[PDB]
């Protein structure tokens, strides 16, 4: 949803965010927010636009 | 029927201009058959007088080869 496609095709992921969302430290909303504020999202959908 | 040779004289009626325009007013020229009807109409619109037209390149009365 966030990156319009699964970026495991490139081996890109935010491992600590994934662990936090799976184990319940953060919710899916906080995971989505931290995922859209990350370096990956900034590189994909902030810089080129 | 390929090429007409046309002598025409088109006086001036909408302006008087100080450039050389004898070549535009009185002229003899070669026109194509398909262009000739439109050319004659345009000359007649401008009030020009058509003096003589001759057949030069093509031959009259050819069913094909035109």
């Amino acid at each position: 949803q966030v990156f319009e496609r699964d970026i495991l095709a490139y081996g890109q992921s935010i491992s600590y965010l994934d662990s936090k969302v799976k184990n319940g430290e953060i919710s899916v909303k906080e995971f989505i927010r931290l995922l859209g504020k990350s370096e990956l999202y900034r590189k994909q959908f902030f810089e080129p636009f | 029927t390929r090429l007409f040779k046309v002598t025409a004289l088109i006086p001036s009626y909408k302006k008087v201009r100080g450039g050389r325009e004898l070549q535009n007013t009185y002229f003899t020229k070669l026109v194509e058959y398909d262009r000739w009807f439109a050319e004659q109409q345009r000359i007649q619109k401008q009030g020009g007088k058509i003096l003589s037209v001759k057949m030069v390149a093509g031959k009259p009365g050819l069913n094909t080869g035109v």
Binding site: - | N63, T64, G65, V66
Partner: protein, 160 residues
């Protein structure tokens, strides 16, 4: 003809004919005997082709001969068959010429306003040339039938 179009195309660009133009002219004159015997076969079959084409025209389109139609009456039917003969002769001319130019300078250029002057339906014309296609291609050999049918295709498309 093919040579005429090739020469005009070469002259327009102020240059000698290209190897493609020469190749098409060579293929045209190489197949002269076949298209020539095809035209002979078409011309030796004047009346069979004309009469069967007229019959199929009138039985697929009954209203041309029906009262009020374009071909109602004997004289109008005669003129219809006369035009059929005209177009058959033009098809032979195009076949020997190797191109559809003779049909164009004779029968295609200005046909629409001609038949609009004569109040002749153009769907009737295309039906007639289709019937003549069928009748003529029936007589010819399989290889030659296609060659005839392509010129008939051009005529049918040109009418409507």
């Amino acid at each position: 003809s093919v040579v005429t179009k090739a020469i005009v195309s070469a002259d327009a660009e102020a240059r000698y004919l290209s190897p493609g133009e020469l190749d098409r002219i060579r293929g045209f004159v190489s197949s002269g005997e076949r298209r020539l015997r095809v035209a002979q076969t078409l011309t030796e079959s004047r009346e069979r082709i004309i009469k069967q084409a007229g019959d199929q025209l009138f039985q697929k389109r009954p209203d041309l001969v029906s009262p009020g139609g374009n071909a109602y009456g004997a004289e109008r039917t005669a003129s219809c068959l006369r035009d059929l003969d005209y177009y058959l002769r033009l098809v032979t001319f195009g076949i020997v010429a190797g191109d559809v130019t003779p049909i164009e300078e004779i029968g295609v250029i200005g046909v629409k306003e001609m038949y609009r002057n004569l109040e002749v339906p153009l769907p009737g014309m295309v039906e007639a040339v289709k019937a003549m296609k069928s009748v003529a291609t029936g007589l010819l050999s399989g290889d030659d039938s296609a060659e005839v049918g392509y010129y008939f295709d051009y005529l049918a498309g040109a009418l409507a």
